């Protein structure tokens, strides 16, 4: 299950094809969603300078509108290949890295 794990050092992230059963803060529960990170250093911007990577959240295949992103309840990790539980590996990899989102599903390089 770890053979397909990839480390992308240009944005300090991990590519792993897993599903997150995250629980949004204040009792909101989400089913098997995931994340997608895009790396763009030439985007035209205004006052939102503090960004080179844009992170989108995909739930049930549809983009989730962000209102207050404070989910810190982890997730029952499910490897969609053959339905493995990899939650402990995920929680370890997350504490090991100071990045906001340590695990994504696909990274797009717009350089």
């Amino acid at each position: 299950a770890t053979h397909d794990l990839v480390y992308h050092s240009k944005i300090n992230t991990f590519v792993w094809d897993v599903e997150f059963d995250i629980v949004l803060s204040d009792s909101k529960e989400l089913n098997k969603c995931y994340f997608v990170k895009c790396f763009n250093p030439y985007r035209i911007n205004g006052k939102c300078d503090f960004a080179v990577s844009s992170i989108d959240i995909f739930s049930e295949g549809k983009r989730l509108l962000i209102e207050n992103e404070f989910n810190f309840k982890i997730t029952k990790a499910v490897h969609v290949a053959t339905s493995k539980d990899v939650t402990e590996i995920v929680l370890h990899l997350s504490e090991r890295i100071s990045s906001p989102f340590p695990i994504v599903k696909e990274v797009v390089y717009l350089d």
Partner: protein, 645 residues
């Protein structure tokens, strides 16, 4: 093997142990009195031989070489992709069997594989006698190849297709498939050459390789000469051999030009050529001088190179070629012909989408070429009319299933690097934005892959024109009400484009109350101005966290303060909880032992430049130096070289 015919048009003697007939032929060609010592029959035969040799570009012997410069010229409508011309030519009644052969090849190139198979069968039936066996043999080969391609299309269209392409989309009927399977139940192509009359085998020996599974191993193996690092050249030899292969395969109307092996060979050849050219340029710069060589790579790129790269390359291969073989220093050649080719591509795309006569078999072949050509057209300077037509075709009539909104924006931004935005292109983009706004009126939402949406088009418009106002969008938002929320959100994403009165009328439909409202509004909408009351709201949030003393909120306000978007002394009262906030607020007193270099991987160009301009500089330089020395990381080295040096 009595002679060697070199690719530049020269002939040398290799194994001829008898009379040098070819030298005597050249001597007859050069002279005129010596030409006249022959009979009438021999004279006309010599004239025909002279015409053939001049047509095939055999110039002279090696000793008498003079002013040897070679230029390729392919005379096939299928190569240049003039689809309408071949469509018209198919309709006209044929005169001979060669016209039928050409019509069959054109039909195959246009995706009408059933008609092409039927025409090949008809040609096979008619032509069996008696000296035109070449046509019969080539027709057999092409018929087998089309059968193979139909089987493979069926294979990757029953599965990995259907709704995943849009509909079950049975390319051909089941009666045709059954007949095809029955007619080729045990066909073997390996014995096809050996069954021909012995005079055909003796004469047309050179066609035997057409009956083999692989026929390009010699050139692929020879491609190793372009990887030598030891200081005509191999570049010219390889390029001329490639042109020769392409011309032979396209002028004789052979269907092997559409298989994976040929595409792979073309890709390998072109990529290796460009790699060798770039490496030679780098070596010359290293030894000779910084600019004595001129820094201009010697690989001149012409119309045919652009056509080959467009046709035979995927997007990922072009991306690799760009990454490893920097192209901006490679200058393109003939630009008018390239512009005409791109305009033809755009017109064909427009015709295919508008007429709704989508040919599912032809679509798969054509769309990859269209995408590659539009991706590679960044380095070509285009006139106003061609650019307008290309932009219109790309934005409006390009199918959504292959180019979502983000990829379309990427293509458009690429097209504007070497050409910039004139008024007409801005008008076209404004029309596209208006159409999208009308489309948003619902159970509708945009889908993108790279994370770029309609806001970026307006951002680019404002980047190229600071004083642009969309009158149609202003009229759209003036009639807007509070019922349709998504339209208000979409117009918010395009806030700066609207007029002042439209802006004031639009503000009535959304206001900010809490810190969530502030962060969300600045995040997606535009609240660039930081009013004191919004600042007070942030101060309330910070006080709440202070007394209460986990995702990211505080570092955002710290960076905003460091960028002087917020000006107040209360920020110094919130030092201690989040180290990044302290670093961005109080740099002089910050304990750099807590600094982690990974923070430098999340800042854009402007923030990094502003950090480089603040003196904090030396500690960051030390951290980056240590990081580069320990682990050879390319991002850290790039940042340090670009901004801190």
């Amino acid at each position: 093997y009595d002679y060697h015919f070199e690719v530049n048009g020269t002939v040398v003697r290799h194994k001829n142990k008898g009379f040098g007939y070819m030298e005597r032929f050249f001597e007859l060609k050069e002279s005129c009195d010596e030409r006249s010592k022959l009979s009438k029959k021999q004279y006309e035969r010599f004239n025909a031989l002279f015409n053939f040799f001049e047509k095939n570009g055999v110039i002279c012997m090696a000793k008498d070489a003079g002013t040897l410069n070679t230029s390729i010229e392919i005379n096939s409508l299928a190569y240049h992709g003039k689809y309408d011309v071949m469509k018209k030519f198919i309709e006209e009644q044929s005169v001979s069997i060669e016209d039928d052969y050409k019509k069959a090849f054109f039909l195959a190139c246009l995706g009408r594989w059933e008609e092409s198979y039927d025409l090949y069968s008809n040609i096979i039936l008619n032509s069996i006698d008696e000296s035109n066996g070449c046509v019969y043999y080539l027709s057999q080969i092409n018929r087998y190849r089309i059968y193979q391609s139909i089987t493979q299309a069926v294979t990757q269209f029953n599965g990995l297709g259907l709704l995943t392409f849009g509909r079950h989309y049975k390319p051909f009927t089941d009666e045709f498939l059954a007949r095809i399977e029955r007619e080729m139940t045990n066909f073997n192509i390996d014995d096809l050459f050996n069954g021909m009359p012995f005079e055909f085998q003796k004469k047309y020996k050179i066609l035997e390789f057409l009956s083999d599974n692989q026929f390009l191993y010699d050139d692929t193996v020879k491609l190793f000469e372009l990887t030598n690092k030891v200081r005509m050249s191999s570049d010219i030899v390889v390029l001329l051999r490639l042109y020769d292969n392409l011309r032979f395969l396209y002028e004789n109307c052979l269907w092997s030009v559409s298989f994976h092996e040929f595409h792979q060979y073309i890709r390998n050849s072109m990529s290796l050529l460009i790699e060798k050219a770039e490496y030679e340029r780098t070596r010359d710069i290293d030894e000779l001088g910084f600019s004595f060589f001129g820094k201009k790579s010697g690989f001149f790129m012409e119309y045919y190179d652009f056509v080959n790269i467009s046709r035979h390359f995927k997007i990922d291969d072009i991306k690799n070629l760009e990454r490893s073989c920097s192209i901006d220093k490679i200058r393109f050649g003939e630009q008018e012909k390239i512009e005409e080719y791109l305009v033809g591509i755009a017109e064909e795309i427009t015709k295919q989408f508008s007429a709704n006569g989508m040919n599912v078999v032809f679509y798969t072949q054509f769309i990859s070429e269209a995408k590659a050509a539009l991706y590679f057209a960044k380095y070509v300077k285009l006139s106003e009319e061609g650019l307008g037509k290309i932009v219109k075709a790309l934005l409006f009539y390009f199918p959504e299933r292959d180019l979502d909104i983000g990829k379309r924006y990427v293509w458009l931004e690429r097209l504007t690097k070497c050409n910039e935005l004139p008024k007409s292109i801005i008008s076209i983009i404004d029309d596209f934005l208006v159409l999208q706004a009308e489309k948003h009126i619902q159970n509708y939402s945009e889908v993108s892959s790279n994370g770029l949406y309609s806001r970026d088009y307006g951002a680019l418009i404002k980047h190229f024109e600071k004083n642009f106002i969309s009158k149609r969008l202003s009229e759209i938002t003036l009639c807007l009400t509070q019922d349709k929320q998504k339209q208000i959100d979409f117009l918010f994403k395009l806030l700066p484009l609207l007029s002042t009165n439209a802006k004031s009328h639009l503000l009535s439909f959304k206001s900010v109350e809490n810190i969530n409202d502030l962060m969300n509004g600045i995040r997606i909408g535009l609240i660039d101005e930081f009013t004191p009351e919004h600042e007070e709201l942030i101060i309330e949030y910070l006080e709440t966290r202070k007394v209460n003393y986990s995702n990211d909120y505080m570092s955002t306000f710290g960076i905003w303060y460091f960028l002087e978007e917020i000006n107040n002394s209360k920020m110094e009262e919130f030092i201690g909880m989040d180290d990044q906030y302290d670093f961005f607020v109080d740099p002089e007193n910050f304990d750099y032992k807590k600094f982690i270099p990974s923070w430098l991987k999340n800042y854009n160009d402007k923030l990094l430049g502003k950090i480089a301009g603040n003196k904090m500089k030396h500690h960051v330089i030390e951290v980056l130096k240590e990081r580069v020395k320990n682990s050879n990381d390319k991002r850290y080295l790039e940042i340090l070289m670009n901004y801190f040096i």
